[PDB]
């Protein structure tokens, strides 16, 4: 009957079109801040001196980019890991020159996507569900925090964060391979098994349900009209799908339990993305992937090359050409 | 037929890529199985008795007093950073040279008195206490000559 | 017959206590006698480079590839 | 008749031993950069 209790009843109401909740009190202002700043910076933002060497990189559509080449460029290397809000910048043009919008978007996005995760817990609690959908969303949240926050922290600069652009993402990937050999890191290998396996199991589970649908339609209408929303009966023969996949490989290698099967669909990509998020987070502190350069040696002592050595020649080509004016000394220790 | 070495027991063992030959490949005894170095006995080229090692430590002790004596010239000014930098720029090698020359039991207790006064000079310089730096700097000097007057 | 009741029977382990170590030894002898280098043409650690050839041997002809390889593997 | 956990014990001890030899062989002999 009080004013706060009527506000609490509206915030936690499951009858709103979108659930707000108390995490939405952090989710909606931070993500709409980051969305507003991203759209304005992607369309029209002046070039950013990313490498701190007064060589400004254009990233917006009004400075000659397209959708692929356009980016919100990371902060200046001269800033480093320093906090650069607008009020610490003496003019907005100085803030725009030094890659200020990147720090505003990334910090509001990472706060807002952690609050999106807690909002996913919160609605499940108000709906009487089991809680752990937001644990599955923690795997892309850990990945976003690794490339936007954790890898800047270990390298000591927001300039080494992943650019908010399509071609900036590929620039982030190639320099990471030259400096950390992520392909030879087993945590990226588990991540590739997470997304190759996850899209395998998605196409596998989606095939066997669609293969074993029960006749409820004619040849003229769509097959999806055989399902009614809110029906209690099963819409596909799971015995027929188990008998198919049990004959495709062999019988003992197939889930007859649909609850164990859907748990395996949740676990395989999420654990795979968790591990590759802890690959980026541990290559942030330069615990790099496997180095097998000049490891095969013949009897005289000469180096016999392997495929890791040919991979090393491609790593050498990226690292001698990346940030080509930024280096003054023979080791890229940053 | 290829060269074999089960760890050191079966086969060659004294081959260029055997990794678990702990000391069995070389003739001279190692410091430990987990080492590549021989011990610190004789046949080592480093002689700790040597005159150029002692003279390097004595030259640190002599120049320490020269750096310790330009402390109050920073304290009639107020360059407190120059006091803290003087105690650490050249004088970083002083604790290594003083403890190397402190062999007897009275040398060690006469050395820590110099060390306590050196930390009183530093702590008063962070606190910017002007009289306390100079009152510690003369105690650091007077404990330095007492250490060098022994030997 | 079920699977796990086979490998727990002692008759299975009477047969496979002889056959499995004999195949493991025979795989070991395939390497120890140096036969696998002669079957597949893999260089031993002695013979990546020879006294005449200090370079990496490549095949540069398609139809005399068998005869070019015989000249590169004579030493 | 053998207990099934006893087979998985010595079977897993054989897999541990063989993978220990494969990781030892990465530090010794060929491919060890030595």
């Amino acid at each position: 009957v009080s004013l706060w209790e009527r506000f609490c009843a509206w915030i936690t109401s499951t009858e709103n079109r979108l659930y707000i909740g108390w995490f939405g009190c952090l989710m909606f202002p931070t993500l709409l801040t980051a969305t507003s700043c991203f759209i304005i910076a992607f369309i029209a933002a002046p070039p950013v001196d990313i490498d701190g060497i007064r060589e400004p990189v254009a990233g917006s559509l009004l400075y000659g980019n397209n959708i692929i080449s356009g980016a919100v460029v990371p902060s200046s290397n001269a800033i480093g890991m320093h906090f650069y809000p607008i009020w610490e910048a003496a003019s907005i043009d100085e803030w725009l020159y030094n890659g200020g919008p990147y720090q505003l978007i990334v910090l509001h996005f990472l706060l807002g996507v952690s609050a999106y995760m807690g909002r996913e817990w919160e609605l499940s609690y108000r709906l009487g569900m089991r809680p752990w959908i937001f644990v599955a969303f923690s795997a892309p949240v850990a990945a976003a925090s690794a490339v936007f926050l954790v890898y800047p922290i270990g390298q000591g600069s927001f300039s080494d964060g992943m650019p908010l652009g399509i071609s900036g993402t590929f620039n982030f990937m190639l320099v990471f391979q030259a400096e950390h050999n992520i392909l030879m890191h087993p945590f990226h290998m588990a991540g590739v098994a997470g997304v190759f396996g996850g899209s395998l199991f998605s196409a596998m589970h989606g095939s066997l349900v669609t293969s074993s649908l029960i006749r409820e339609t004619t040849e003229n209408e769509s097959t999806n009209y055989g399902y009614k929303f809110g029906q209690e009966e099963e819409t596909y023969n799971i015995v027929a799908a188990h008998g198919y996949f049990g004959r495709l490989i062999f019988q003992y290698a197939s889930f007859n339990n649909s609850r164990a099967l859907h748990f395996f669909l949740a676990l395989w990509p999420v654990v795979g993305i968790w591990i590759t998020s802890m690959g980026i987070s541990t290559m942030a502190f330069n615990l790099n992937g496997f180095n097998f350069n000049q490891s095969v040696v013949d009897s005289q002592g000469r180096v016999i090359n392997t495929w890791a050595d040919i991979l090393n020649r491609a790593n050498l080509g990226i690292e001698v050409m990346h940030e080509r004016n930024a280096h003054n000394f023979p080791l890229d220790l940053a | 037929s290829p060269r074999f070495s089960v760890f050191g027991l079966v086969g060659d063992g004294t081959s260029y890529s055997e990794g678990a030959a702990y000391g069995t490949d070389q003739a001279d005894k190692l410091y430990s199985p987990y080492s590549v170095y021989s011990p610190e006995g004789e046949k080592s080229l480093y002689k700790p008795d040597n005159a150029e090692y002692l003279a390097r430590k004595k030259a640190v002790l002599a120049e320490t007093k020269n750096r310790l004596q330009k402390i109050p010239a920073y304290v009639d000014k107020k360059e407190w950073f120059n006091v803290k930098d003087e105690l650490t720029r050249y004088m970083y090698e002083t604790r290594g040279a003083v403890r190397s020359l402190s062999s007897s039991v009275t040398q060690k207790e006469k050395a820590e008195v110099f060390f306590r006064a050196l930390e009183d000079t530093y702590g008063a310089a962070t606190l910017k206490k002007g009289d306390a730096v100079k009152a510690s700097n003369d105690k650091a000097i007077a404990a330095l000559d007492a250490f060098t007057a022994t030997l | 017959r079920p699977f796990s009741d086979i490998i727990t029977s002692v008759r299975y382990w009477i047969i496979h206590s002889i056959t499995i170590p004999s195949l493991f030894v025979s795989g070991w002898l395939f390497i120890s006698t140096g036969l696998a280098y002669d079957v597949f043409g893999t260089p031993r650690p002695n013979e990546y480079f020879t006294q005449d050839r200090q370079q990496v041997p490549l095949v540069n002809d398609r139809f005399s590839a068998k005869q070019e390889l015989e000249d590169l593997t004579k030493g | 008749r053998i207990p099934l956990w006893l087979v998985g014990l010595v079977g897993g001890l054989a897999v541990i031993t063989m993978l220990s030899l494969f990781f030892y062989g990465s530090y010794s002999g060929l491919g060890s950069s030595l």
Binding site: - | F4, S5, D12, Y16 | L23, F24, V25, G27, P45 | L21
Partner: peptide, 28 residues
């Protein structure tokens, strides 16, 4: 009889694993 379907995989596997285990003790 299901012998030569599992033994087509198991017999070369134990032969190959005996070879790879012998390869760990080959030195240059």
């Amino acid at each position: 009889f299901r012998w030569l379907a599992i033994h087509g995989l198991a017999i070369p596997t134990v032969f190959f694993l005996g070879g790879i285990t012998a390869m760990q003790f080959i030195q240059r």
